[PDB]
Design an enzyme around this catalytic site. Structure first.
Site, PDB file in Angstrom:
ATOM      1  N   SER A  23     105.289 -25.360  -1.609  1.00  0.00           N
ATOM      2  CA  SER A  23     104.613 -23.977  -1.878  1.00  0.00           C
ATOM      3  C   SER A  23     106.124 -23.175  -2.135  1.00  0.00           C
ATOM      4  CB  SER A  23     103.982 -24.013  -0.611  1.00  0.00           C
ATOM      5  OG  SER A  23     102.887 -23.386  -0.456  1.00  0.00           O
ATOM      6  N   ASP A  47      93.802 -42.005   0.622  1.00  0.00           N
ATOM      7  CA  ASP A  47      94.764 -41.943   1.639  1.00  0.00           C
ATOM      8  C   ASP A  47      95.194 -41.635  -0.393  1.00  0.00           C
ATOM      9  OD1 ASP A  47      96.220 -40.495   2.738  1.00  0.00           O
ATOM     10  OD2 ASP A  47      96.619 -43.294   3.717  1.00  0.00           O
TER      11      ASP A  47
HETATM   12  C1  LIG Z   1     104.758 -39.262  12.275  1.00  0.00           C
HETATM   13  C2  LIG Z   1     105.848 -39.409  11.045  1.00  0.00           C
HETATM   14  C3  LIG Z   1     106.405 -39.634   9.360  1.00  0.00           C
HETATM   15  N1  LIG Z   1     105.271 -39.577   8.871  1.00  0.00           N
HETATM   16  C4  LIG Z   1     104.760 -41.379   8.558  1.00  0.00           C
HETATM   17  C5  LIG Z   1     103.897 -38.778   8.607  1.00  0.00           C
HETATM   18  C6  LIG Z   1     103.860 -39.112   7.217  1.00  0.00           C
HETATM   19  N2  LIG Z   1     102.381 -39.978   7.212  1.00  0.00           N
HETATM   20  C7  LIG Z   1     101.442 -40.085   6.462  1.00  0.00           C
HETATM   21  C8  LIG Z   1      99.722 -40.645   6.278  1.00  0.00           C
HETATM   22  O1  LIG Z   1     100.177 -41.775   6.685  1.00  0.00           O
HETATM   23  C9  LIG Z   1      99.381 -41.043   4.678  1.00  0.00           C
HETATM   24  N3  LIG Z   1      98.263 -40.690   5.028  1.00  0.00           N
HETATM   25  C10 LIG Z   1      97.747 -39.920   6.935  1.00  0.00           C
HETATM   26  C11 LIG Z   1      96.680 -41.080   6.849  1.00  0.00           C
HETATM   27  N4  LIG Z   1      96.410 -41.408   8.493  1.00  0.00           N
HETATM   28  C12 LIG Z   1      95.049 -42.323   7.980  1.00  0.00           C
HETATM   29  C13 LIG Z   1      94.459 -42.776   8.962  1.00  0.00           C
HETATM   30  C14 LIG Z   1      95.109 -43.116  10.519  1.00  0.00           C
HETATM   31  C15 LIG Z   1      94.557 -43.723  10.979  1.00  0.00           C
HETATM   32  C16 LIG Z   1      92.803 -43.244  11.438  1.00  0.00           C
HETATM   33 BR1  LIG Z   1      92.007 -44.222  12.660  1.00  0.00          BR
HETATM   34  C17 LIG Z   1      92.335 -43.666   9.677  1.00  0.00           C
HETATM   35  C18 LIG Z   1      92.657 -43.203   8.561  1.00  0.00           C
HETATM   36  N5  LIG Z   1      94.956 -42.047   6.852  1.00  0.00           N
HETATM   37  O2  LIG Z   1      95.567 -41.604   5.598  1.00  0.00           O
HETATM   38  C19 LIG Z   1      98.770 -40.033   7.550  1.00  0.00           C
HETATM   39  C20 LIG Z   1     101.940 -40.068   5.228  1.00  0.00           C
HETATM   40  S1  LIG Z   1     103.586 -39.047   5.608  1.00  0.00           S
END
Ligand SMILES: C#CCN(C)Cc1nc([C@]2(O)CN[C@@H](c3nc(-c4ccc(Br)cc4)no3)C2)cs1
Length: 330
Positions: free
Chosen positions: A199, A35
């Protein structure tokens, strides 16, 4: 040193990708979701609440001769979908694709939320964003990449995700056979802890390119491509019957449609996402409404170049003193 590991979609939609990771001595192999949008390496474990484990492979630190409790350290994280996990911390030897880090913080889950329990194929996460996002307290820990960096031949890793097919994560080298043309590098801001870049615009299908700056993050842990509502509306307007559904939670389109491609700019270069990559299939089994792979970022506060975008490219995460991202067609 270098490492190279194959990453494999967990299902027929490419909802996520899992990569085998060796932890401990003798090795315990767990399949982790790499991730680039987070910075914790956490695993299902012998400490995870039993009712919250459903088919995952667990790490058992008491069976590893190299495991050591990181005394007093705890961790707790939430993800953009509202999922979460928390627990305590061991250090242990962790190897990815032949590349070994000794003393890596391995965050052992005591609790995981329902979406993790429900995904039997994901044994944990391996964060590859910047270590400033790591949640371990009171002593923040480094990512696997940050720990490996000084030993690598080059301070980089690459993501080469497949479309309905396996792909590759490489550490420490750039496989020049894995892409076509050149790699275009673009500046990264680490101010939010992400691989954040800008981008240079977009095109829909065969349309002309719209030059416009789109800040966002390169996030292998996010399934879809989340962009501003203006861009997303311009895309879905080209698909007969497509609409945003409040009940479903995003844009849906008739499964009878053939989707246009979507192009995004990287500097003066262009990455073309084929239309088929934007099809996430029926919203429920047997439905003729299909879920779109391009969705609005308006509710989340950040644009996310997730797997839909990244799997159309060979992507270099350059962790040199001045970090950059590279994109090539493939
Ligand atoms: C709402 C809002 C504002 N911000 C918090 C959006 C962002 N969100 C991220 C992540 O949290 C990091 N990479 C994603 C990720 N989700 C997973 C995952 C989740 C559940 C399962 Br079951 C399996 C894998 N792995 O990575 C999303 C970065 S910015």
């Amino acid at each position: 040193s270098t490492g190279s590991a194959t990453t494999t979609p967990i299902d027929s939609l490419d909802d996520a990708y899992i990569t085998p990771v060796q932890i401990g001595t003798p090795a315990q192999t767990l399949n982790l979701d790499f991730d680039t949008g987070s910075s914790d390496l956490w695993v299902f474990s012998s400490e995870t609440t039993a009712s919250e484990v459903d088919g995952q492979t667990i790490y058992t630190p008491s069976k590893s001769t190299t495991a050591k409790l990181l005394s007093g350290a705890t961790w707790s994280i939430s993800y953009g979908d509202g999922s979460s996990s928390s627990g305590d911390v061991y250090t242990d030897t962790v190897s990815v694709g032949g590349l070994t880090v000794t003393g890596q913080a391995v965050e052992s889950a005591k609790k995981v939320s329902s979406s993790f329990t429900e995904d039997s194929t994901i044994d944990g996460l391996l964060g590859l964003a910047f270590s400033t996002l790591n949640t371990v307290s009171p002593t923040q820990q480094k990512t696997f990449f940050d720990n490996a960096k000084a030993s690598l031949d080059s301070p980089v890793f690459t993501a080469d995700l497949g479309y309905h097919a396996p792909g590759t994560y490489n550490f420490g080298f750039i496989d020049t056979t894995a892409y076509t043309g050149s790699i275009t590098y673009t500046a990264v801001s680490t101010k939010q802890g992400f691989w954040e870049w800008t981008s240079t615009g977009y095109a829909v299908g065969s349309g002309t390119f719209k030059s416009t700056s789109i800040d966002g993050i390169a996030d292998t842990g996010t399934t879809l491509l989340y962009l501003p509502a203006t861009v997303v509306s311009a895309y879905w307007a080209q698909v007969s019957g497509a609409k945003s559904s409040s009940s479903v939670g995003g844009y849906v389109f008739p499964c009878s449609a053939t989707l246009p491609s979507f192009t995004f700019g990287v500097g003066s270069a262009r990455i073309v996402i084929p239309g088929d990559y934007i099809d996430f299939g029926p919203i429920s089994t047997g439905s003729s409404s299909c879920f779109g792979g391009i969705q609005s970022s308006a509710g989340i506060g950040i644009n996310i170049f997730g797997d839909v975008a990244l799997k159309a490219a060979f992507v270099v995460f350059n962790g040199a003193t001045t970090p950059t991202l590279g994109f090539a067609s493939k």
